[PDB]
Design a protein around this ligand. Structure first.
Ligand code: SF4
Length: 543
């Protein structure tokens, strides 16, 4: 008998499932509360969907509850059982109220109807509503593939919402799709269709977030980012939320406290609005998984706006601040998940008592090649492709992680011929953005479009190139896809790319545990998804 079952991230035990404790640190009761939360969120989605079908309004507060619930269960987001149990209660209360407004209550699922206030009852329920509750291998695989894609979609939708952008069609889809994953009548064909539809709405969510980010902070532009440090106390902001950074920068103005980015906050540097704060210093360290070392050496407080937070060492736990849907028991939390005013005064005061950061490297890296910037350079890129100066683009976007095998991505990047350009987005970049790879005709050989959500820009760029070259098929561009994944935002990016018709994606360092043999076969047969081997072998085989 397993104490838990979770297989949603790349590091899952044995590439099969975490059954005792998560490799990420997630304890079984935490896992159970997340399972209960997803269950009642799907129930809420059914009720809201039914209300929409009856012609009844569903308030945007419900949308926010759903996206917050999903995001709270993303890998490395929230380990705080008290917070998770309260989200279960909030969700039960909300769906009971919504169900009261239904004219016809027939056909409501157990998820829609079930409630508990006591944590013990939540844990008991979790035992029968987890991944393994679906007996059929393929239905299970697709249900969870969709659910994980929906988590990624919800994260991006939530960031857009934080910046004041939401689309009824997106929230309605998310809630309908969640409900469909509890509908036992849906066929495998229905679920494959829903998988691809989820990808399509993934593009929509990424487009919305792209519009929100650029509308608020400007279009990213070419930027040199310092990776060394100054001599003032600092705050290190990590995760993805740019609105949190805006508020933090405004509040640190005049204080003598500098602000540094970490992991997926690096791309904040690329936005013109943030360049106007002189105390916005560099990017410190590498991807999320090195944070037990890098948060320690940073010395100042660290603010986690989203995942990935790893269970902190006691050495720096007292200077970890979470916000939004991030949580860890014993770590201070700054309240707010809708972009409302956040008071950073305590973190700023804390920073003044800490030593300045310990430098771990110096120099600069270049980025800011999101869609507006690359389209501004399109003629020169096109000319370089036509002349043979650029023989291939390699999309190496996605997530980094702990696995030793990910040395592959560094070695692959280093071994690429010097007539290739790497396109990147997401923290996967850290496996090769500190190498000395040079340039082709002045175009850097690593073009960083931004955060994992800025994979959207890479798709926009590919589609632009398809148009300019007059190609019928996006796959006839000189682009190889060698994508690394870790968590559920990478899942929605993958589904988005598949919905756009991108084939031949090499995904690694392993393939998700949640793909059943038959589901994997469909992805191979229709999309030619593959994995990785050795860097030297793939440097030959992939081209
Ligand atoms: S999030 Fe990943 S490492 Fe954590 S319990 Fe789930 S599969 Fe395991």
């Amino acid at each position: 008998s397993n104490a838990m079952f979770c297989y949603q991230c790349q590091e899952t035990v044995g590439n099969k499932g975490c059954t005792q404790v998560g490799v990420c640190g997630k304890k079984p009761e935490t896992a159970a509360l997340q399972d209960a939360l997803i269950y009642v969120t799907k129930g809420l989605g059914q009720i809201a969907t039914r209300l929409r079908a009856e012609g009844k309004a569903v308030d945007h507060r419900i949308d926010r509850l759903v996206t917050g619930n999903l995001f709270a269960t993303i890998t490395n987001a929230n380990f705080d059982d008290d917070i998770l149990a309260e989200r279960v209660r909030m969700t039960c209360a909300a769906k009971k109220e919504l169900a009261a407004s239904l004219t016809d209550k027939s056909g409501l699922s157990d998820a829609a109807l079930w409630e508990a206030s006591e944590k013990s009852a939540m844990l008991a329920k979790a035992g029968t509503v987890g991944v393994m509750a679906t007996t059929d291998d393929d239905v299970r695989s697709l249900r969870w593939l969709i659910t994980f894609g929906l988590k990624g979609m919800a994260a991006y939708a939530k960031h857009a919402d934080v910046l004041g952008k939401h689309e009824n069609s997106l929230d309605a889809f998310m809630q309908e799709a969640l409900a469909k994953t509890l509908d036992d009548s849906l066929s495998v064909a229905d679920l494959v269709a829903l998988t691809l539809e989820t990808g399509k709405f993934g593009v929509s969510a990424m487009a919305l977030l792209d519009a929100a980010n650029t509308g608020t902070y400007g279009h990213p532009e070419i930027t040199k980012v310092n990776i060394g440090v100054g001599s003032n106390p600092g705050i290190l902001i990590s995760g993805h939320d740019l609105r949190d950074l805006e508020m933090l920068l405004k509040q640190t103005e005049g204080t003598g406290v500098d602000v540094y980015t970490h992991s997926e906050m690096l791309p904040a540097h690329y936005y013109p609005a943030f360049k106007k704060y002189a105390h916005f210093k560099g990017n410190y360290g590498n991807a999320w998984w090195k944070q037990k070392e890098e948060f320690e050496s940073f010395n100042g407080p660290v603010l986690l706006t989203t995942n990935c937070l790893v269970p902190p060492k006691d050495s720096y736990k007292d200077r970890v601040y979470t916000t939004g849907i991030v949580g860890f028991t014993g770590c201070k939390h700054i309240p707010g998940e809708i972009g409302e005013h956040k008071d950073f005064s305590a973190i700023i005061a804390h920073a003044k008592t800490c030593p300045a950061p310990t430098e771990i490297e110096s120099g600069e890296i270049i980025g800011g090649f999101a869609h507006n910037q690359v389209l501004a350079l399109a003629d020169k890129v096109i000319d370089a492709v036509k002349s043979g100066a650029i023989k291939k683009f390699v999309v190496m976007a996605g997530c980094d992680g702990r696995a030793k095998s990910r040395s592959y991505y560094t070695d692959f990047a280093e071994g690429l011929p010097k007539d290739t350009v790497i396109l990147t987005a997401g923290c996967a970049k850290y496996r090769y953005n500190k190498l000395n790879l040079g340039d082709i005709g002045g175009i850097p050989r690593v073009l960083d479009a931004g955060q994992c959500n800025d994979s959207y820009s890479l798709a926009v760029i590919a589609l632009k190139l398809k148009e300019v070259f007059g190609l019928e098929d996006v796959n006839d561009l000189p682009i190889v896809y060698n994508i690394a994944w870790y968590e559920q935002k990478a899942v929605i990016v993958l589904l988005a790319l598949l919905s756009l018709g991108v084939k031949n994606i090499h995904l690694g360092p392993t393939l998700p545990a949640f793909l059943s043999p038959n589901v994997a076969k469909v992805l191979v047969e229709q999309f030619n998804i593959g994995g990785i081997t050795s860097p030297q072998d793939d440097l030959k085989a992939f081209f």
